[PDB]
Design a protein around this ligand. Structure first.
Ligand SMILES: [Mn+2]
Ligand SMILES: [Mn+2]
Ligand SMILES: [Mn+2]
Ligand SMILES: [Mn+2]
Ligand SMILES: [Mn+2]
Ligand SMILES: [Mn+2]
Ligand SMILES: [Mn+2]
Ligand SMILES: [Mn+2]
Ligand SMILES: [Mn+2]
Ligand SMILES: [Mn+2]
Lengths: 174, 174, 174, 174, 174
């Protein structure tokens, strides 16, 4: 806190707390998506594993931000985690579209914080984001776009067939 | 028998013998299902292996009940095993529906025996069922429901295609 | 969902969703406690590790409940996660007292759900709780009480000394 | 030198030579601190090892800067190393306070050079500092702040007791 | 019994049965002490382990005496085991004082039996005690006295502090 803090604006401190909230909310959305695809009336294991893995990744991103907040001498402040935007997530296509909207929102929040850090002349913040978040997001969004295209090519006139095939042949399962 | 028996009602004893019969009848039904899918005009190896594995599991459940009957001092009594309800089992979908009806009947018989044991203040019986049967049944029924949903999504307009694919890509085979 | 559900009341289904919320809220409280003890002006590593480990344990409990909800054919429903009750947690003694209040509330919710399950004649639910939650809670609460007594014996007239010593000599750290 | 130099201002070149001096002066201060805590009338081995390790780390930082100066085509220029600011360093608390003042001064010099590099549109310089220095400094300052808080909680009415305990139970020794 | 007995007086036989009782009573006292220090409001693990280990050692001494009684042809006779002298044992100091009183009583009973054996010209008895009991008791009493002195030096004005420290730094714990 006040004995270590140096070159760490109140504006960046607050924005880091809001970004933690966003990552934890994304983790919660992925938890919901993963358990939806584990329903016996949905039953797509590879899709469940894909989203449950992302729930863990988004948690870990939040935790890295909170570690950094303490390393800089700021104070972590927590807010409510809003419930996810849907209770039921539709098809794998619907879910993957909602995931890429979610990641684009996270990426925009990263970019906005980076611009704040650069305006504040806070290079540790900017490098932190560049090294641990910006490329993770670009890689994930690319993977999701790759998946979207493949899901879309499989719809055909045979949508259940395509949904099965994608889960079996692209996504990771036992 | 009479030198060891303690807190073991005649009602539970008889109901355990009837539950052994039910499990052995289920094992016999699965034996029939497994060999039906081994017919050269049916020829779904993964489906055969799925049902033949369940025939063994239902036998083993019967044998655990018979061991318990002796551990409590009751007397095993055997009845005829009725032949299975069908000689030919249709499609994998037909078979999986008949399996989930069969397991729901076994699960109801478990629940009914548990309620009898609890009315009789027989906690060893109740715990025996809870520890060795109730969750096995819930897990199996969930797996069957997962399979049902996937089989159903594959029917499409291309039912033979779907049946093949499910057997190849979900069920275990050489 | 409706193809597998058997002996699973709407009352238990809803109560499981509320218990998931409680466990996730407890996990969030522990996340806050852990990062508070990582502040440079608090700086008790063993205390941070103790609470961060509990954040993971409470998450995993929520996830086991959600898996069970799907295994029974119920539908997971998520609500907002309320922020934790404090932003700053005081001394290790204050924190440990707040943790035992939190665990006693979770344990009471487990006991209440167990009584509901027993009134509903749902032995799978009751055994699920007995096997995976009730003794975990009793063991954890006992450990917390052990810690409380040791923290209290260390206050003395030398409270900072005691706080350091407990963290160094009882809690796990690098 | 002139055959390789590209996008490397005279201003950055001179500022790198001054930063080398600062790191070597910090290394010299740590050498003095380490041998002070090795005095038979001070005799805190863990404190000696903590500062002697930092003397090596600050040397290595200077050497990385000098390697970079040559990689860019600048010319290393050396100045006198001023003696450290004290001949005797007081208590572990006094020493740790003087270390965090020293590191905050180094960190400010890093930040100032980074701003110069960014004004000069020298991204290799800026990334060099971000990758090899800025987070090292933030991590070290955080560790020192953690130590300060623990040393301070141990003073109590029993300062010698606290000083011993911290050295024994937090710092690394044989 | 009568086919093997040689040089084994009725007086030694009866005194061995009384000494078995004393060792089993000591084992019972240690069992009580060990579980007292496992209370959540006492919570000294190392103290619990120290007494629980002694409960086992005193049992094993009783069993060695009973084996010897049979080896000599005497007849083991059992009496009631009196409950321990306290239900609650106070501080570690109180407990250690009560343990050394208990061991001094056992040692006096050993010495008295040895004198009986020597009056009876029973060298096998005397050597049995010398080889398997007398030095075990002297070593244990010495260890307890060592502990007593260290517990006493730690009381200071800070008794809870001392009690914690002794448990942590002298006694064996996880
Ligand atoms: Mn799954
Ligand atoms: Mn999942
Ligand atoms: Mn076959
Ligand atoms: Mn077969
Ligand atoms: Mn930590
Ligand atoms: Mn932590
Ligand atoms: Mn040294
Ligand atoms: Mn040194
Ligand atoms: Mn114990
Ligand atoms: Mn014990």
């Amino acid at each position: 806190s006040s004995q270590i803090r140096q070159n760490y604006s109140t504006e960046v401190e607050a924005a880091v707390n809001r970004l933690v909230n966003l990552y934890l909310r994304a983790s919660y959305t992925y938890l919901s998506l993963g358990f939806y695809f584990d329903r016996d009336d949905v039953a797509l294991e590879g899709v469940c594993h894909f989203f449950c893995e992302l729930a863990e990744e988004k948690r870990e991103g939040a935790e890295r931000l909170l570690k950094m907040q303490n390393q800089r001498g700021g104070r972590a402040l927590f807010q409510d985690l809003q419930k996810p935007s849907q209770d039921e997530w539709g098809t794998t296509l619907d879910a993957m579209k909602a995931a890429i909207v979610l990641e684009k929102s996270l990426n925009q929040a990263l970019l906005d914080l980076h611009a704040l850090g650069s305006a504040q002349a806070d290079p540790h913040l900017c490098d932190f984001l560049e090294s641990h978040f910006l490329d993770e997001e670009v890689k994930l969004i690319k993977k999701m776009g790759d998946h979207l295209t493949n899901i879309q090519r499989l719809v055909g006139s045979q949508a259940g067939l395509g949904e099965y095939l994608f889960e079996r042949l692209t996504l990771k399962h036992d």
